[PDB]
Design a protein around this motif. Structure first.
Motif, PDB file in Angstrom:
ATOM      1  N   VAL A 221       0.839  -1.190   0.000  1.00 10.69           N
ATOM      2  CA  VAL A 221       0.000   0.000   0.000  1.00 10.69           C
ATOM      3  C   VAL A 221       0.879   1.246   0.000  1.00 10.69           C
ATOM      4  O   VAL A 221       2.099   1.178   0.112  1.00 10.69           O
ATOM      5  CB  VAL A 221      -0.982   0.027   1.182  1.00 10.69           C
ATOM      6  N   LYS A 222       0.225   2.394  -0.141  1.00  9.63           N
ATOM      7  CA  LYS A 222       0.871   3.696  -0.197  1.00  9.63           C
ATOM      8  C   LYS A 222       1.035   4.280   1.203  1.00  9.63           C
ATOM      9  O   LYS A 222       0.433   3.824   2.176  1.00  9.63           O
ATOM     10  CB  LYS A 222       0.057   4.651  -1.065  1.00  9.63           C
ATOM     11  N   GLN A 223       1.836   5.333   1.300  1.00 11.86           N
ATOM     12  CA  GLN A 223       2.070   6.032   2.552  1.00 11.86           C
ATOM     13  C   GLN A 223       1.861   7.520   2.355  1.00 11.86           C
ATOM     14  O   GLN A 223       2.184   8.066   1.302  1.00 11.86           O
ATOM     15  CB  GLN A 223       3.467   5.779   3.071  1.00 11.86           C
ATOM     16  N   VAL A 224       1.321   8.167   3.376  1.00 10.55           N
ATOM     17  CA  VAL A 224       0.952   9.575   3.323  1.00 10.55           C
ATOM     18  C   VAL A 224       1.637  10.308   4.464  1.00 10.55           C
ATOM     19  O   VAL A 224       1.828   9.753   5.550  1.00 10.55           O
ATOM     20  CB  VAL A 224      -0.577   9.764   3.393  1.00 10.55           C
ATOM     21  N   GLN A 225       1.984  11.562   4.211  1.00 12.61           N
ATOM     22  CA  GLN A 225       2.588  12.460   5.181  1.00 12.61           C
ATOM     23  C   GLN A 225       1.654  13.634   5.413  1.00 12.61           C
ATOM     24  O   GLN A 225       1.297  14.331   4.466  1.00 12.61           O
ATOM     25  CB  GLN A 225       3.938  12.943   4.668  1.00 12.61           C
TER      26      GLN A 225
END
Lengths: 52, 51
Positions: free
Chosen positions: A6-10
């Motif tokens: 999956v993706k990662q967000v900041q």
């Protein structure tokens, strides 16, 4: 078909506050006291009773 | 993650008209000034032990 990377967000929040204030005051305090011979002028009744 | 902070304060109390004169004014006023800054950070690093 399900298990995939999956993706990662900041996320970044920012709280800002600003304040200003001004104040000014003027005041005066004055008094008089005089006598003439059987005649007086003051700033109260206890004042005239004292200058006797 | 991390947290960043900054702050600034200023203050003056003076005599209504004299505390503003160009060079003499410093005789008629009190001045206060303060500034702060802070910063926090968190790191992580993993590793597989290869025997």
């Amino acid at each position: 078909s399900l298990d995939i990377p999956v993706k990662q967000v900041q996320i970044e929040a920012r709280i800002v506050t600003v304040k200003e204030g001004n104040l000014e005051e003027l005041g005066v305090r004055w008094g008089v006291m005089s006598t003439n011979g059987s005649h007086s002028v003051g700033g109260s009744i206890e004042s005239n009773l004292w200058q006797k | 993650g991390g947290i960043f902070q900054h702050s600034i304060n200023n203050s003056v109390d003076k005599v209504p008209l004299l505390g503003d004169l160009p060079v003499l004014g410093a005789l008629f006023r009190r001045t206060y000034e303060q500034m702060g800054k802070s910063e926090l950070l968190i790191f992580v690093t993993p590793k597989v032990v290869i025997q």
